[PDB]
Design a protein around this motif. Structure first.
Motif, PDB file in Angstrom:
ATOM      1  N   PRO A 150       0.709  -1.260   0.044  1.00 34.30           N
ATOM      2  CA  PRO A 150       0.033  -0.175  -0.272  1.00 34.30           C
ATOM      3  C   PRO A 150       0.779   1.619  -0.046  1.00 34.30           C
ATOM      4  O   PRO A 150       1.070   2.498  -0.994  1.00 34.30           O
ATOM      5  N   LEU A 151       1.514   0.899   0.705  1.00 31.24           N
ATOM      6  CA  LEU A 151       2.749   2.319   0.525  1.00 31.24           C
ATOM      7  C   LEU A 151       3.988   2.919  -0.404  1.00 31.24           C
ATOM      8  O   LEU A 151       4.539   3.864   0.086  1.00 31.24           O
TER       9      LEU A 151
ATOM     10  N   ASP B 128       4.639  -3.047   7.958  1.00 31.33           N
ATOM     11  CA  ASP B 128       4.786  -3.387   6.692  1.00 31.33           C
ATOM     12  C   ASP B 128       4.536  -2.807   5.388  1.00 31.33           C
ATOM     13  O   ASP B 128       4.103  -3.270   4.468  1.00 31.33           O
ATOM     14  N   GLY B 129       3.806  -1.432   5.701  1.00 31.90           N
ATOM     15  CA  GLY B 129       3.735  -0.914   5.124  1.00 31.90           C
ATOM     16  C   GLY B 129       2.463  -0.885   4.344  1.00 31.90           C
ATOM     17  O   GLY B 129       1.740  -0.726   2.986  1.00 31.90           O
ATOM     18  N   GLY B 130       1.561  -2.039   4.959  1.00 30.68           N
ATOM     19  CA  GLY B 130       0.188  -2.496   4.664  1.00 30.68           C
ATOM     20  C   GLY B 130      -0.145  -4.504   3.767  1.00 30.68           C
ATOM     21  O   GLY B 130      -0.491  -4.564   3.531  1.00 30.68           O
ATOM     22  N   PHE B 131       1.453  -4.394   3.289  1.00 35.06           N
ATOM     23  CA  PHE B 131       1.302  -5.540   2.119  1.00 35.06           C
ATOM     24  C   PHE B 131       1.067  -6.383   2.783  1.00 35.06           C
ATOM     25  O   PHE B 131       0.224  -7.477   2.459  1.00 35.06           O
TER      26      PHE B 131
END
Lengths: 246, 245, 248, 243
Positions: B204-205, B237-240
């Motif tokens: 996501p990031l 994890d930045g959204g993963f």
């Protein structure tokens, strides 16, 4: 049955009150040729007894201590001499030294108890899938095993056994991951419990404990081509308990 | 900073740009007095030198290989001459025999490799919760450990380290049920990675996280700011992890 | 503080001891300058007064019924008159009509009551997400929201509102996914119960043997919208002292 | 078959390639007496044809917009004038306004889209349980609904349905614990797509068929699954379990 024509191995029939014993029973009703393993000579008699009434026979019973690699490989050499192939392996082995399973978790849990509980209850299942990869070649069968809610959340005195169960269920997904290209489906059935066993009954949505039978039926299905789009599943047969909090 | 007053033991610092080194940094940024263990004699000089730059001394560095109860115990008995109590233990020891993490899972996984992976990467945590229970008494401290998405869904060659982690992650929950009463919280931090460009576009990031970012979270988790959080696995994890495709 | 230099809008301040206020207090205490919405005309005086103890002023308060898209942008139209940009939205409003949240689920759960429970508790998040997208652009900011364990497991008399949070939680992930590209982080805190007979068992079960406080749920919530937590999006942070992880 | 004896109301049948259809075929095969709904006046006869091919007849077909309370009402009323008891209700209708399933989640999602998305894809279940409570009472029956991975994780152009679906899945859980005491079980099948790159990653290295989802769907509503309630069973080859 819907399991007619398939041929299944069944690990850890130790009793008839067992959860293994509900599965074997329902798996014969549904038309499967069965085989059995017994951990040791003590239990050799009563496995063969049960076996004979389950469509099977003393000659389809083999000695296996899943802590041993060779003995597992030995089971798959001998069995492989009566059947041209295997379709199903069932795994019902739960063992950790009792001193790990009563007291403060942090307190009683030793390294060796951790080693064992995991070995017997988690990796045995990978070894079984390993030691039988060849005999399940081109059968499009499946593997099954038993888990408990204590791998997803905590409860008293279950302790280090929840670490084993959590690993098993992971092992289940990774087994599904790899074994699937050749068509093997790996799944697991997480059952409910069989004073406070009644405090369970009145929070479980169906207001009742599940029977070793219902787990059999449910574990039967997961091994039948009725369940052939289904891999890496953990199926909860617990009257719906896990879906509750307060 | 938001960790001043707290003492922290850090197990498994082995490189300057490891997630553990990110944690170690932030906790110092935030004032933690830091102590360290070293895995073996080669890494000793490496660990002492890192320690010195994170406000600590080599005095506060002790030999430990988490495969042996006895050495572990000597850690807290050696530290206990320096500190009359300890708040945090940070557990960033993740390892499995190499051959198991290269190939088809069912094919490459071994009994002994299994037993090791689960020993070092999982049980070692509980051994540290135990061995350090006394030093952590009545301080309302916390234990942090590192996990990974492999514990929850599969992915290439992670193999048996995906069972290890899942066992770890359950031990987080269990150590929490246990030590909570006394006021110890137990938490984990599941980091993203650091052509792996597939990951990134999906995340996501749109980027990876950094040991910095994994350490602020690591830190926060072990600081009084967190004191209402326990038994938890925080995903840096930045959204993963939340994406299916 | 660590939110220093950050600007936030805060939706849902209705009591002085809500989770909403726990966040607002925390967030101020760490440097963020704040703005507030009042649900209606009765709470204006309360909300404004609170806002002043939190560095904010009456001017920085705006009217907004999160059932009204037009008012939702009235906030941001008016706010962007004091602020060229925004950094945070905190979304803290739980409401299903009372008759829905009482008794046997299936019996007392009605289509309208369902509609409301989801339109207030869930869509509104997406709408603050929408409405303020322009002002949050470039700021690498974040949205934060509040959920409960009910959404993931059942507990008596939460009924339809657990349906409306599972929706919300899912919403968090979709927003986090949509808006990550341009930098917006989207997360949630999911508190356990708060103190003031059925609650005493809750705390015998929860690992920390105590309920959490809005000072705990607010720090978590504060942190989660600070560059400290800049590697964290799509996340549902549990603040219940470990309750969510126990089964007996 | 294991559903022999059982009677079942199926909501959602609209196409040959339906998931709804896959369950009905596998359910009828397993020996159930089925009975169907049709949304509009179009598709009426098309339901009937499928119904008459599934051991049923056009008299066990009733008009129903799951959006309108009174129709669902009228469904079970009329049905209880052919039937003594009911055993199974099946819920296979998914619908969000198309615009919502095309583009940036934040940008395209509107409130009205949300509403319909949730009312259709999630409230309908509750209402079906609700409005058909009495005919199931005594019977130790079961409900079944359909969901998808978009509740549990994100993916392009699913948007609000992931929200609808998430709600529905709680709805499974809340129902199950409400209607458990009287014997009613409540479950869901989370079926994968019936996508090319999807296939590469799913463990069976293939997608699932409507015969595979229909079987499991049948299994769960049968007495062979009486120890199961509150579940989101995944028929997708193990895709959910992959990263």
């Amino acid at each position: 049955g819907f399991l007619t024509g398939k041929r299944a191995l069944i690990v850890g029939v130790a009793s008839k009150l067992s959860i293994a014993s509900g599965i074997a029973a329902a798996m014969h009703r549904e038309g499967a040729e069965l085989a059995f393993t017994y951990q040791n000579d003590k239990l050799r008699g009563r496995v063969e007894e049960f076996a004979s009434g389950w469509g099977s026979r003393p000659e389809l019973c083999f000695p296996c201590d899943v802590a041993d690699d060779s003995q597992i490989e030995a089971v798959f050499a001998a069995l492989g001499k009566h059947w041209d192939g295997l379709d199903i392996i069932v795994h019902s082995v739960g063992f950790a030294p009792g001193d790990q399973l009563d007291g403060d978790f942090t307190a009683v849990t030793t390294r060796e108890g951790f080693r064992i509980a995991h070995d017997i209850s988690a990796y045995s299942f990978i070894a079984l899938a390993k030691a039988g990869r060849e005999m399940m070649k081109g059968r499009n069968g499946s593997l099954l095993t038993l888990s408990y809610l204590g791998a997803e959340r905590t409860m008293p005195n279950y302790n280090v056994m929840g670490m084993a169960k959590a690993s098993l269920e992971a092992g289940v997904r990774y087994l599904a991951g790899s074994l699937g290209a050749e068509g093997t489906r790996v799944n697991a059935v997480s059952a409910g419990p069989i004073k406070m066993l009644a405090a369970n009954e009145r929070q479980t949505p169906l207001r009742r404990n599940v029977t070793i039978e219902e787990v059999g039926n449910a574990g039967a299905f997961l091994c039948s081509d009725l369940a052939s789009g289904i891999s890496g599943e953990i199926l909860y047969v617990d009257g719906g308990f896990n879906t509750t909090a307060m």
